[PDB]
Write a protein that holds these residues in place. Structure first.
Motif, PDB file in Angstrom:
ATOM      1  N   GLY A  78       0.785  -1.226   0.000  1.00  0.00           N
ATOM      2  CA  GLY A  78       0.000   0.000   0.000  1.00  0.00           C
ATOM      3  C   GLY A  78       0.820   1.280   0.000  1.00  0.00           C
ATOM      4  O   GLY A  78       2.002   1.273   0.338  1.00  0.00           O
ATOM      5  N   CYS A  79       0.186   2.388  -0.374  1.00  0.00           N
ATOM      6  CA  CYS A  79       0.861   3.680  -0.433  1.00  0.00           C
ATOM      7  C   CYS A  79       0.481   4.564   0.748  1.00  0.00           C
ATOM      8  O   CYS A  79      -0.689   4.660   1.107  1.00  0.00           O
ATOM      9  CB  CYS A  79       0.520   4.400  -1.737  1.00  0.00           C
ATOM     10  N   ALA A  80       1.472   5.216   1.351  1.00  0.00           N
ATOM     11  CA  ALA A  80       1.219   6.106   2.485  1.00  0.00           C
ATOM     12  C   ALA A  80       2.110   7.357   2.470  1.00  0.00           C
ATOM     13  O   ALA A  80       3.250   7.323   2.001  1.00  0.00           O
ATOM     14  CB  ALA A  80       1.376   5.356   3.784  1.00  0.00           C
ATOM     15  N   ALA A  81       1.577   8.461   2.988  1.00  0.00           N
ATOM     16  CA  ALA A  81       2.280   9.739   2.972  1.00  0.00           C
ATOM     17  C   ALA A  81       2.336  10.337   4.368  1.00  0.00           C
ATOM     18  O   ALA A  81       1.332  10.367   5.073  1.00  0.00           O
ATOM     19  CB  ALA A  81       1.597  10.691   2.031  1.00  0.00           C
ATOM     20  N   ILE A  82       3.512  10.810   4.763  1.00  0.00           N
ATOM     21  CA  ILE A  82       3.691  11.462   6.057  1.00  0.00           C
ATOM     22  C   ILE A  82       4.018  12.927   5.806  1.00  0.00           C
ATOM     23  O   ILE A  82       5.071  13.237   5.240  1.00  0.00           O
ATOM     24  CB  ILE A  82       4.864  10.836   6.848  1.00  0.00           C
ATOM     25  N   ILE A  83       3.126  13.834   6.201  1.00  0.00           N
ATOM     26  CA  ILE A  83       3.368  15.252   5.951  1.00  0.00           C
ATOM     27  C   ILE A  83       3.821  15.956   7.212  1.00  0.00           C
ATOM     28  O   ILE A  83       3.169  15.872   8.254  1.00  0.00           O
ATOM     29  CB  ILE A  83       2.144  15.981   5.387  1.00  0.00           C
ATOM     30  N   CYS A  84       4.939  16.662   7.110  1.00  0.00           N
ATOM     31  CA  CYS A  84       5.490  17.350   8.266  1.00  0.00           C
ATOM     32  C   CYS A  84       5.531  18.869   8.088  1.00  0.00           C
ATOM     33  O   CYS A  84       5.601  19.373   6.971  1.00  0.00           O
ATOM     34  CB  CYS A  84       6.874  16.790   8.588  1.00  0.00           C
TER      35      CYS A  84
END
Ligand SMILES: [Fe+3]
Ligand SMILES: [Fe+3]
Length: 911
Positions: A563-569
């Motif tokens: 699966g695809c995942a994004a961590i935004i900081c």
DNA sequence: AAAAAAAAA
């Protein structure tokens, strides 16, 4: 008195010959007449002639007369003496010492000579015409004030000899332009547009090739007939000038919505609504606001509405404003193919350029090109050399660019009349309206005000937009249309906006028609599962977040099933750290890691972006390229990324941005080409937040980018929701509106006060920057270009500078790479050590934008480029950042400006 | 402590 041809208007570049002031004057007159007839939008001729309360043919002749008077101020000893000339027959007017510009002379003379032809002495018309012409090099001057009864003399025009010649010339152009009668009426904003027109006339007939040609056939004497002939000959030549510069109108035939998008199988809810209800509404100048989600084809909707507003206002030109250079690049391509299909495929416009307007366009090899040379042989819509220049971009018949290029028209700055003029004949479409901040917003408001009074129709596209902003923007347009500002007792034009929804504003009667007004039924969009939003507390070490535990927990299902995942900081260092954390963890085995923020070299960021929209985007899902992958990023995710992620992890941010972020969650679910692993039950947003120890506290790094109160307000807002998911688009607008409107969400009164004062700072700094409201500029153009005590900005804040890292060995020789194989260019490889566009291209590809700060006040000699780079506009303002490399071959953190810098190949610039 | 834009006659 027969006129003396000895008086010149041009010398330089003419091989020792000089071109007489009469001839340049008539050229300009003729150029304006032609521009008026073959260049101006039909509906702009109509607006201009209405202000002057006369017919188009008379308007045009008036204007041709004025344009042929622009350089009248050169007819003075002070200007004429700059070259060799026999002035023995013209005594008097000895040099005053003032060193006064020829354009200022023009505005000082005309108010007192123009009455001899019919103009009212002291009149409003007379004053504007003179002031406008005095503004022909981009700077307006005050009306002449005087204390005697002999203004001519008081301003230096004291020689009867010099005065007869100034009068002969006045009557000569008057005669050649058909002796038009003075108009009864003229006003500032009109006059400011005509000035842009007079400027474009000066520019066109000032090209050396044109002049070298006219020099072969100068008139024999100053006789009426010789001068009539010169004028006519110049008339004949001006249309080739339009073709060569790329300036011919592009007109697109009326069509229906499906006729305009024949490869669009199913027209949309939005699209069916607009195309069905708007044609009745679009009877003349007006504004359309459209607020809708992504993937609802606002693009195709806007083209269609633009054509409608286009036909209604007799304005065939277009300008599409985009939030970024990248998005402007995308849309310029889109708009080109649209234009190809739409314009009559039999009659392609080969001499009409579709311009791309931003500061990095020259280095675009697609757009940028590599005289009457190749006339009528260019590719249709292709960029012309003439339109590369200066402040000419908005004169292109169609254009796409940054919103910044439109905002520069209403900033107090030289030649802003040129940009007003270029805009005046177009329909203007601004995309991503919800992305302009309070400072840009005051600018967009003054722009809307000026378009309104110039009868230019406007389409505003937005994602979800706060009702106060929507109100401000439509109020400003209306203010311009109606000639006066809002009262404190007058009811607001927009009290609610709906998402999705659209709205139409009639300039004439001021009536605002919402979509709900013409169909009760709501507009149908793509059905999506409600978005799950979950607040997760996160521990705090030394004022920062320890994302360790949480990242491990929430990403574990991805390591198992894919699966695809994004961590935004919230900041760069935070994203840099998080990538290191997952770097080490993933070393213990599957899955892919990526990192994107602003601090990468241009080429490497374009690279990272491309493989990223590739894997996670639409075309990757359709090509079966979608992996079975973790993205770490900053707010770069906020603009222009085709991504579809299965899970998103974001730091807290204003809900507006948090909802924009979450637009990436299952972006392309309707297209059932997409596999979601089992653990991906719902589209879900994990919002990170510090665990508290009574109004919420947040890391200082966060409160440096977003106002604490805003963070506090959002946190409270979301907590209040008790885990309840967000119906999209059903609950969206509510959340956008209430995070500002609901005062119980702000428990820290001091922070909320600091937030509103900060916004006050932003609006007020903007209010100082822009030109006057159209009603304040009614009889006086001077505040258009007035400033005292630095170029005024289109964006608030400190800005950025591009930096270039070089590398040093222990000698130290300097190289462009960490391997020290590619030498640092002191000179560029072009003939005579000069830099080519290709050089500047390969160099600017390595540069990185860095946020301004204290470090820039502490630079030294080895941070500034060599002598040779000072030549190139493109390389001049670069900042060099040295990087030490050991003999063993390791790159060390290196001091610059009071801190250490390290360009990492995986994490980009560190400091 | 984010991101974003930004020589004429
Ligand atoms: Fe001039
Ligand atoms: Fe001139």
């Amino acid at each position: 008195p027969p006129l003396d041809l000895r008086f010149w208007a041009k010398e330089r570049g003419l091989r020792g010959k000089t071109y007489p002031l009469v001839c340049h004057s008539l050229d300009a007159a003729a150029a304006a007449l032609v521009l008026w007839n073959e260049y101006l939008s039909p509906g702009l001729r109509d607006t201009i002639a209405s202000s002057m309360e006369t017919d188009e043919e008379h308007a045009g002749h008036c204007i041709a007369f004025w344009a042929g008077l622009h350089d009248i101020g050169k007819l003075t000893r002070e200007f004429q003496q700059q070259i060799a000339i026999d002035l023995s027959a013209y005594p008097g007017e000895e040099l005053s010492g003032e060193q006064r510009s020829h354009a200022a002379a023009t505005g000082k003379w005309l108010p007192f000579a123009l009455p001899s032809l019919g103009y009212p002495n002291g009149g409003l018309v007379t004053g504007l015409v003179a002031q406008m012409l005095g503004g022909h090099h981009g700077t307006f001057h005050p009306h002449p004030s005087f204390q005697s009864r002999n203004p001519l003399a008081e301003f230096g025009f004291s020689s009867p000899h010099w005065e007869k010649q100034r009068h002969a010339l006045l009557h000569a152009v008057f005669d050649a332009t058909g002796r038009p009668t003075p108009p009864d009426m003229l006003d500032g904003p009109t006059a400011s547009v005509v000035c842009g027109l007079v400027i474009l006339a000066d520019w066109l007939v000032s090209q050396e090739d044109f002049l070298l040609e006219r020099l072969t056939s100068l008139p024999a004497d100053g006789s009426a007939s010789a001068l009539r002939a010169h004028f006519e000959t110049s008339l004949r030549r001006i249309p080739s000038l339009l073709d060569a510069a790329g300036l011919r109108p592009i007109t697109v035939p009326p069509a229906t919505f499906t006729e305009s998008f024949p490869h669009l199988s199913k027209p949309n809810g939005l699209q069916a609504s607009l195309a069905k209800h708007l044609p009745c509404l679009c009877t003349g100048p007006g504004l359309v606001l459209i607020t809708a989600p992504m993937g609802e084809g606002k693009t195709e909707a806007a083209y269609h509405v633009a054509d409608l507003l286009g036909k209604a206002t007799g304005r065939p030109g277009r300008f599409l404003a985009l939030p970024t250079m990248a998005t402007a690049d995308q849309m310029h391509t889109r708009l080109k193919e649209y234009a190809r299909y739409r314009v009559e495929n039999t009659d392609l416009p080969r001499s009409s350029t579709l311009a791309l307007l931003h500061s990095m366009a020259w280095l675009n090899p697609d757009y940028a090109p590599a005289v009457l040379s190749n006339l009528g042989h260019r590719d249709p819509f292709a960029a012309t050399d003439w339109l590369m220049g200066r402040k000419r971009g908005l004169l292109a018949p169609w254009a796409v660019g940054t919103i910044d290029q439109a905002l520069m028209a209403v900033l107090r700055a030289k030649h802003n009349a040129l940009r007003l003029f270029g805009l005046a004949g177009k329909v203007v479409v601004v995309d991503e309206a919800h992305a302009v901040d309070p400072y840009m917003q005051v600018l967009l408001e003054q722009l809307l005000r000026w378009l309104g009074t110039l009868d230019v129709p406007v389409v505003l596209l937005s994602a979800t937009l706060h009702h106060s902003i929507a109100n401000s923007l439509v109020k400003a347009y209306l203010e311009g249309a109606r000639g006066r500002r809002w009262n404190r007792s007058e009811p607001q034009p927009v009290s609610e906006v709906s998402y999705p929804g659209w709205l139409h504003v009639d300039a004439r009667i001021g009536k605002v028609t919402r979509s709900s007004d013409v169909d009760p039924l709501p507009i149908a969009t793509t059905p999506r599962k409600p978005l799950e939003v979950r607040l997760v507390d996160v521990p705090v070490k030394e004022g920062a977040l320890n994302r360790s535990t949480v990242l491990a927990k929430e990403l574990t299902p991805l390591v198992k099933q894919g699966g695809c995942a994004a961590i935004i900081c919230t900041t760069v260092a935070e994203a840099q750290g998080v990538y290191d954390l997952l770097s080490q963890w993933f070393a213990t085995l599957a899955p892919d890691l990526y990192l994107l923020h602003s601090r990468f070299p241009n080429r490497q960021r374009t690279e990272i972006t491309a493989t990223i929209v590739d894997l996670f985007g639409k075309e990757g899902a359709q090509s079966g390229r979608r992996p079975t992958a973790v993205l770490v990023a900053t707010q770069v995710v906020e603009q222009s990324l085709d991504l579809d992620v299965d899970l998103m992890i974001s730091d807290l941010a204003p809900v507006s941005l948090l909802l924009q972020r979450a637009g990436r969650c299952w972006r392309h679910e309707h297209l059932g080409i997409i596999n979601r692993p089992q653990w991906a039950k719902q589209p879900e947003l994990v919002v990170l937040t510090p665990e508290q120890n009574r109004a919420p506290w947040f890391p200082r790094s966060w409160t440096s980018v977003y106002p604490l109160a805003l963070l506090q307000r959002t946190y409270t807002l979301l907590r209040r929701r008790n885990g309840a998911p967000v119906q999209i688009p059903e609950d969206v607008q509510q959340l956008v509106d209430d995070v500002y409107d609901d005062d119980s969400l702000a428990e820290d009164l001091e922070a909320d006060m600091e937030r509103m004062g900060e916004e006050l700072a932003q609006r007020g700094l903007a209010r100082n920057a822009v030109i006057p409201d159209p009603d304040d500029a009614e009889d006086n153009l001077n505040g258009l270009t007035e400033f005292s005590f630095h170029v005024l900005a289109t964006r608030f804040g400190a800005g950025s500078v591009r930096v270039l890292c070089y590398y040093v060995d222990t000698a130290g020789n300097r190289w462009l790479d960490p391997e020290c194989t590619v030498e640092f260019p002191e000179q560029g490889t072009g003939r005579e050590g000069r830099f080519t566009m290709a050089d500047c291209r390969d160099l600017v590809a390595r540069t990185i934008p860095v946020r301004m700060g204290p470090w820039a006040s502490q630079l030294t000699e080895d941070n500034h480029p060599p002598e040779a780079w000072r030549e190139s506009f493109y390389l001049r303002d670069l900042v060099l950042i040295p990087q030490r490399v050991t003999d063993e071959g390791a790159v060390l953190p290196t001091e610059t400006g009071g801190r250490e810098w390290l360009l990492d190949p995986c994490k980009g610039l560190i400091f």
